[PDB]
Every structure is written in C-alpha cells, then in structure tokens.
Design a protein around this ligand. Structure first.
Ligand SMILES: [Mg+2]
Ligand SMILES: [Mg+2]
Ligand SMILES: [Mg+2]
Ligand SMILES: [Mg+2]
Ligand SMILES: [Mg+2]
Ligand SMILES: [Mg+2]
Ligand SMILES: [Mg+2]
Ligand SMILES: [Mg+2]
Ligand SMILES: [Mg+2]
Ligand SMILES: [Mg+2]
Ligand SMILES: [Mg+2]
Ligand SMILES: [Mg+2]
Ligand SMILES: [Mg+2]
Ligand SMILES: [Mg+2]
Ligand SMILES: [Mg+2]
Ligand SMILES: [Mg+2]
Ligand SMILES: [Mg+2]
Ligand SMILES: [Mg+2]
Ligand SMILES: [Mg+2]
Ligand SMILES: [Mg+2]
Ligand SMILES: [Mg+2]
Ligand SMILES: [Mg+2]
Ligand SMILES: [Mg+2]
Ligand SMILES: [Mg+2]
Ligand SMILES: [Mg+2]
Ligand SMILES: [Mg+2]
Ligand SMILES: [Mg+2]
Ligand SMILES: [Mg+2]
Ligand SMILES: [Mg+2]
Ligand SMILES: [Mg+2]
Ligand SMILES: [Mg+2]
Ligand SMILES: [Mg+2]
Ligand SMILES: [Mg+2]
Ligand SMILES: [Mg+2]
Ligand SMILES: [Mg+2]
Ligand SMILES: [Mg+2]
Ligand SMILES: [Mg+2]
Ligand SMILES: [Mg+2]
Ligand SMILES: [Mg+2]
Ligand SMILES: [Mg+2]
Ligand SMILES: [Mg+2]
Ligand SMILES: [Zn+2]
Lengths: 69, 83, 116, 23, 181, 97
RNA sequence: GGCGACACACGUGCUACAAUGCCCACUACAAAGCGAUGCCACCCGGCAACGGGGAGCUAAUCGCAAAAAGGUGGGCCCAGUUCGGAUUGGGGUCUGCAACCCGACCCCAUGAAGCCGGAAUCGCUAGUAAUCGCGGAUCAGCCAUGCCGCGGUGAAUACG
RNA sequence: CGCCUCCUAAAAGGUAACGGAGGCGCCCAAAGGUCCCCUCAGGCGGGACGGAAAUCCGCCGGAGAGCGCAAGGGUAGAAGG
C-alpha cells in the first residue's frame, strides 16, 4: 500500500450490549455497539421480540358462545 | 363498542336462518335488514344481501370480516366525486 | 442508533427523551424507568452505560416499536381497505374515519384546500 | 391546554375524570 | 496474512461443506472470494461542495483503505453533470482487508440496519456474484453519530470465483450471510 | 369569493355564471369587492335580485325587481354601480378649501 | 336509509400558536340551581371510564360538590418544545331492543396545522371588558365548544 | 465571387452547368515534444438514494465509440484515455 494515506488497522475489541465480544481488526481499538449477530432477533432463530401472535384475530375472540344453537 | 358483559348482538331472526342453513347443508342467499347484527363465525362463507335503504347488497362473508357489522359492507351513500 | 434505533436526545431527561420514540409516550416513559429503577430525571448524557442497556433491554423486549408498529398499523388499515368495510372506504379516499362532518373542515385528512 | 384530554385541565374542561383527573 | 476469524472459518468450516455439497475434484474449483468493491455514487457533491473528502474520510475508517475518485463519463444536463466531474468513491478490497471488512459487515453492520429482515436472495449476479446497497453509513461500527454530518449509503459488490449463482449462494450463506428467502 | 342564493327557487349553473359575469361590471372601479352575495327570489309580480357587497370605502346594498329575471338582475347592477361610483368619488367633492 | 354526504364558498363559535406560560403534588375562597325506576355519601374491585356493595335525603337537614383562576412547593428552559391536541391504529366502559352508517367517555400508542393572521371587521364606558370555573332547561344517552343563568379575579381609556 | 469535404467524374490524374449536398475566415500553453501505462460504443444480469441515461460489479462485445469543429480518408499492433 501507498504510505501516509491509509488509516492504520490495529487489533480491535467490539463489545455488544449482549456481552458478546468480537476479536477483529479496525481503525479503532475498542468499539461499543447496541446489537450484533449474536443477539439480533432475525439471527437468533424466530426470536419474535414481541408479536408471537399466531393469527391473531379474527376468531381468538370467542366472547363467547352464549348465542343459541 | 358494545359492553362485553352484554352479548355479541344478532337480531335472532337473522341468527336463526344462519343455523338452519348450517344444519342442513347451506347455502341459500339471505336477504336481511339487520345492518346492526354482528358477523358471527357461523356466517363465514355465506353470501347475505344487506339492505342499505334502497338495495339488498350481496355481501360475501370471509374469514377476516367477523368482528364487524353487516352495515359496514353495504354502504348507504352513492358518491363518485365532484366536477 | 442507540435506543431503540432512534438516537434519542441527550441534554434532556430520560422520560422526556424516550417519548421521541414511535410507540413510547409519557405513560410508557414512567413504566420503563420504574421497572429498571432509573431516576426518571437523569439526562441521557448522564446515563451510566449499565443503565442504558438496562433501559434499552426492557423497552425493546416489552413493546412493539418503530418499524414493526408502523407495519402493523398499516396492515390494519390495509386489511380494512381490502375487506371493503366502511372504515376501509374512508381510508381508500383519504376522507375522515371517525364520523366527523365533511361539509366543512376535515382539512387534516383532506389536506390544504383545492380551488375550483 | 383545555383541549388536551390527557391533562388535568382537559378533564376539567370536559367535566370528566380518570387517571389524569381522579375523583 | 493476518489471523481473522472469518478467513479461518472459510478454510476450516466453509470449504469442507462446499466440497461435500458439490463434489469438486480440484482444490482450485471450490468457490472463493475474489474481491469486494465498495462504491459511493455520491453525486450530491457534484458541484455543491465537492468536499466529499468527508466521505473519503469515512470509507477509509470503514475499510482501512483510501477510496479513489470516480469521475463522470459524459456530461448529463438533467442530472446537472459536466464530463469529468467528481461524482463518488470506489475502493477495492482484497485479501485480509476484504476479510476484515466482511467480518464486521456480517457481525455488526447488517444487524444495525433499520428493520433488518435479511439480505435479498435474488440479488445474485447470474454468474455467481452478489450485490447489496446500503442506506446509511452509521451502520458500520467505526462511524459514530458525533462524527457524521450527512446520510450517505453505498453499493457493495461481492465477487466470487463460483461459476453459478447456486455455488455462490452456498459459499456466501455458509460464511454467515443472512438471507430471508 | 362570490356566493349566489336562489331562495325558494331553483336555478342552473348557467344562470349563476350569468350573474357572476354581470356583477363583473363592478370590476370597472378597480376596488375590492369583498364577499359579494346575490339573492334571487320569486314574488307574485316578478323576480327580486338582492345584493350585499362590502368595499374598502363602504357597503353596497340594492334590490332590483322586474317580471324578467335577467332584467331584474340588470336593474340590480345599475343600482349597485350608482352606489359604487358614489363611494369612489364622494370624497373628492370637499377638496377645494 | 337519509336529515351527519363533500372538488369548494360564507356566517357564528371552541382550542391554540406559549415562560404574565405548560405540567405534577399539596392547600384555600363562591353563587345560583337541581335531585325518590332521582341525587348518591362512604367501602371494595379496576391505571381509568366504570362496576359491585351500601347509608342519608319526600331534602337551609342528605347528595350532585371538587369550584377554577388563586396560594405553596417542585419540574420544564425558548426548541413546533413537557407549546398545541387535530388525525389515525388498538384496547375497554356505559346508555339504549339496537351505537355500521351515526353516541358520549376512559386507557395505550400516534402527536397534524398552527411561530399571533391580507383586504376587511366585531364587542365593550365599571365590577364593564378581559379571564376563571359552577348550575339548569332539553335529556335513555349525546354529538353543548350552543343557549339561559350564577358567582370568583378584575382593568384601559373618553381631548373632542 | 476565395478556401475545405463528398458526389456528378465514364475504376490513373484532370474534367463543366445559376447541377446535387455540407462546411471555413477559427482554435490549443496543451489539444505541443518524449517516455511509461491504459482500451471503446453497445447489449444483458446484478447494486441505497438513482431515473432510458450519473457512479459500482460480472459476462458478452474488432470496432459500430473516440479523434475540438463539415465531410471524407485513416486509426485500438492508436492517431483514442
Ligand atoms: Mg513503495
Ligand atoms: Mg518507498
Ligand atoms: Mg413517541
Ligand atoms: Mg360524530
Ligand atoms: Mg385559555
Ligand atoms: Mg399538551
Ligand atoms: Mg486453494
Ligand atoms: Mg438474481
Ligand atoms: Mg463469479
Ligand atoms: Mg455505528
Ligand atoms: Mg353560490
Ligand atoms: Mg350603466
Ligand atoms: Mg337516520
Ligand atoms: Mg340539520
Ligand atoms: Mg358525517
Ligand atoms: Mg362557490
Ligand atoms: Mg362552537
Ligand atoms: Mg378565545
Ligand atoms: Mg420560540
Ligand atoms: Mg411536531
Ligand atoms: Mg409547520
Ligand atoms: Mg408536544
Ligand atoms: Mg377504537
Ligand atoms: Mg351511531
Ligand atoms: Mg393569547
Ligand atoms: Mg384594515
Ligand atoms: Mg353606554
Ligand atoms: Mg357548564
Ligand atoms: Mg342527557
Ligand atoms: Mg473525380
Ligand atoms: Mg471520382
Ligand atoms: Mg478519377
Ligand atoms: Mg499530375
Ligand atoms: Mg450562380
Ligand atoms: Mg456558405
Ligand atoms: Mg498533459
Ligand atoms: Mg458497458
Ligand atoms: Mg443495468
Ligand atoms: Mg433503485
Ligand atoms: Mg443504472
Ligand atoms: Mg468513429
Ligand atoms: Zn449482541
């Protein structure tokens, strides 16, 4: 590589919020991120962050069967 | 919306013709003036004519239109814009 | 893109900041800081990083927010517009939905006046 | 102001009660 | 050649599963990565403030490599484009920096994407290469909210030695590329 | 803008446009015609064309009658012109010391 | 079913565009009215609308009832914001045979326009204007921000 | 009305008409000398904003691009970048 134009790559820590730490390389030796592949809901299986809903409507109402048959 | 303590309202005279069709191998076309009646699941799959004040509108009930009223599907005002 | 994907303002208190999130109002701001035991009057510039991911964790796991919320609200307006019910028609035309008079006003739904 | 239901002043304007104006 | 986990994962895990999935008879036949070409079609800096040096300072932090200036082929009146004008940045990543970039790309960048639901499975070259665009540059771990000024995305070309899209789908998915379909 | 009321009577959009074109004679005086309001009506002997218009210098109120509706309209404009030209020039009279 | 429609246009009003302000907690000070399938104390459940218990009062006795502005304390720090509360998604309550068209209210979320308004134009001469709440008729409920009343705080100016 | 290009012009050169069509009266301090390096237009597929067409990637693609300006000749094994 040409000299004096490229940011030097050094060994680097990456600390995600989920405690996962990656041993990679970067121009910054230590970086904090809010998410990573180890915890992101698309990555960690069908980790439905909230809406493990199912249908949900238009029948799980069932309030109720009091009308006659 | 209606209190949950009260029931899911159907005019009873419409609910009856639903089950007689269910318990015999439906369907015949149902004419009705019961805009106020809820679309209970036993109705799913029928086609019912709703009076809008002028015409009885054929409304095919599907699975995703249950917690609703029959009037919502036979609108009353003809409007096509201005100009 | 701190929490939750929205870079909430520093300089402001936590309860006030978290309102700058799609899905979190004054009510849910009280709920997040009690359930994680954070002083609701602490500026975002002063949250210990332990506090942040503590606050971040509870918020994102409890409630639907930003994109997932917006996709859902749209999906409900979409299904209303597909099943052809009356409210769906009002969304089809951009007219109001909750029974308001349209002979005048309704400028929020219609937009600024179109001359003739 | 008075037109805001989620405040005390709004519930006073309407004559109603709730979480933001208890009785 | 540095020891980077993605490169090691390529040789130790990825290659054996590829040989087994396709039955290659020569070690040079198994798909590998040729290069990763990052491109910014800036153009919002054509005349305005040709101080895209802001962006070159960014891509250099992201890749450890100084990007090079792309200049307009012909002149285009509707785009307000004079032949020769500087309209973006291309940086070509190979060998360890290519691995080092892709390593952080799969681990950190793609997860930070807004409402991320996986890479587009249909974006393949038809000859075994892949391409994806980005909407922002904060996606990367080195570019913080403080230092940024404007929202500039990029194109990323992933060039493999695979002759077909299927072999390339296999290689990239095995490296940790999250596809939705 | 200009409003037209047909009291206890139905008129066409053509008739309304004739009225707007006839009131356009008042644009001669190059003064703001503010919310002009015409009322066409039917009495047992003929039609009545009323009008109320405000200008920066005063208001105009006039009523025209005739068997023929257009003539009653025209008579209205004549009475409205004479008032407008009075509003626009009466101040010039007491000018010399 | 419509009278509630909606490319538009005008009249009357409500809430505002903020710091003489907004929010929360605590604490004062009225008048006139209404009230026996009525007004509801107080207790319990619910964040709440409300629900279940249940006393009192044919009512200067019991109840609607808390008046609000104000006072005290704390927050907000000039940003389309802790200004503003439109619009919409979702969840409930209650009346009523029935709330799709087309009810009011509560709760979560959404959080629009609006930065004081062109030509033009209205009211008001003193407890008035301005501002703050309270009550009643109609009334199952309510589209009342209307109307008829009631008190609280309380000005400016009139040469001519 | 002088000059350039093509045709008329009858396969050397030349060849007329108030015959058929276009251009010139500049320009360039590099658009000149040399050395080194590089190769087009276009089609298809892929890629945030981004489009028929901006920039990126892959495959095909001998010259249809380019060569300041008319036309012709020439030309990438460069006269083009
Ligand atoms: Mg060297
Ligand atoms: Mg050297
Ligand atoms: Mg919010
Ligand atoms: Mg309404
Ligand atoms: Mg006020
Ligand atoms: Mg508010
Ligand atoms: Mg090898
Ligand atoms: Mg493909
Ligand atoms: Mg390939
Ligand atoms: Mg980053
Ligand atoms: Mg009119
Ligand atoms: Mg005349
Ligand atoms: Mg009706
Ligand atoms: Mg009416
Ligand atoms: Mg309406
Ligand atoms: Mg009009
Ligand atoms: Mg009003
Ligand atoms: Mg006012
Ligand atoms: Mg300001
Ligand atoms: Mg805003
Ligand atoms: Mg604005
Ligand atoms: Mg606000
Ligand atoms: Mg709702
Ligand atoms: Mg209704
Ligand atoms: Mg004001
Ligand atoms: Mg004026
Ligand atoms: Mg007087
Ligand atoms: Mg009142
Ligand atoms: Mg009532
Ligand atoms: Mg010749
Ligand atoms: Mg010849
Ligand atoms: Mg010859
Ligand atoms: Mg010779
Ligand atoms: Mg000649
Ligand atoms: Mg010439
Ligand atoms: Mg040079
Ligand atoms: Mg090409
Ligand atoms: Mg293409
Ligand atoms: Mg695109
Ligand atoms: Mg393109
Ligand atoms: Mg050529
Ligand atoms: Zn993580």
């Amino acid at each position: 590589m040409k000299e004096g134009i490229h940011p030097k790559l050094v060994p680097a820590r990456i600390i995600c919020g989920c405690g996962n730490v990656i041993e990679t390389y970067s121009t910054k030796p230590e970086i904090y991120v809010e998410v990573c592949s180890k915890c992101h809901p698309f990555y960690t299986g069908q980790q439905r962050f909230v809406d493990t809903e199912g249908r949900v409507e238009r029948f799980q109402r069932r309030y109720g069967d009091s009308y006659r048959k | 919306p209606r209190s949950l303590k009260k029931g899911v309202f159907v005019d009873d005279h419409l609910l009856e013709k639903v089950l007689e069709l269910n318990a015999k191998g439906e369907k015949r076309l149902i004419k009705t003036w019961s805009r106020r009646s809820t679309i209970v699941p036993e109705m799913v799959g029928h086609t019912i004519a709703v009076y809008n004040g002028k015409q009885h509108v054929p409304v095919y009930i599907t699975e995703n239109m249950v917690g609703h009223k029959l009037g919502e599907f036979a609108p009353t005002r003809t409007y096509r814009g201005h100009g | 893109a701190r929490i939750a994907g929205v870079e909430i303002p520093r300089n402001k208190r936590v309860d006030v900041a978290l309102t700058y999130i799609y899905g979190i109002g004054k009510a849910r701001a009280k709920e997040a800081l009690e359930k994680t035991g954070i002083n609701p009057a602490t500026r975002v510039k002063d949250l210990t990083e332990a506090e942040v991911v503590r606050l971040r964790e509870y918020v994102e796991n409890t409630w639907k927010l930003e994109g997932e919320l917006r996709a859902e609200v749209a999906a409900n307006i979409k299904r209303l517009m597909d099943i052809g019910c009356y409210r769906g028609l009002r969304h089809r035309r951009g007219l109001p939905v909750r029974g308001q008079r349209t002979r005048t006003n309704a400028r929020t739904r219609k937009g600024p006046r179109k001359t003739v | 102001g008075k037109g805001d239901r989620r405040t005390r002043r709004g519930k006073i304007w309407r004559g109603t009660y709730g979480k933001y104006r208890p009785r | 050649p540095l020891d980077v986990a993605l490169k090691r994962k390529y040789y130790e895990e990825v290659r054996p599963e590829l040989i087994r999935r396709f039955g290659y008879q020569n070690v040079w036949e198994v798909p590998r990565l040729e290069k990763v070409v990052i491109n910014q079609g800036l153009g919002e800096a054509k005349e305005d403030a040709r101080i895209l040096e802001k962006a070159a300072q960014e891509l250099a932090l992201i890749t450890g490599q100084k990007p090079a200036v792309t200049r307009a082929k012909k002149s285009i009146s509707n785009f307000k484009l004079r032949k020769g004008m500087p309209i973006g940045l291309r940086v070509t990543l190979r060998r360890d920096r290519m691995w080092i970039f892709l390593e952080k790309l799969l681990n950190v960048a793609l997860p930070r994407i807004r409402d991320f639901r996986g890479l587009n499975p249909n974006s393949f070259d038809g000859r075994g290469n892949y391409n994806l665009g980005l909407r922002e540059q904060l996606i990367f771990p080195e570019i913080t909210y403080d230092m940024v000024d404007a929202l500039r995305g990029m194109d990323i070309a992933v060039v493999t030695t695979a002759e077909t899209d299927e072999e390339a789908r296999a290689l990239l998915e095995l490296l940790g590329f999250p596809f939705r379909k | 803008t200009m409003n037209i009321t047909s009291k206890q009577m139905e008129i066409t959009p053509a008739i309304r446009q004739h009225v707007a074109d006839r009131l356009a004679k008042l644009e001669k005086w190059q003064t703001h015609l503010i919310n002009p309001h015409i009322i066409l009506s039917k009495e047992p002997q003929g039609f009545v064309a009323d009008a109320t218009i405000n200008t920066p210098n005063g208001v105009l109120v006039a009523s025209g009658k005739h068997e023929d509706m257009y003539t009653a309209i025209n008579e209205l404009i004549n009475k409205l012109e004479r008032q407008l030209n009075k509003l626009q020039h009466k101040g010039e009279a007491r000018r010399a010391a």
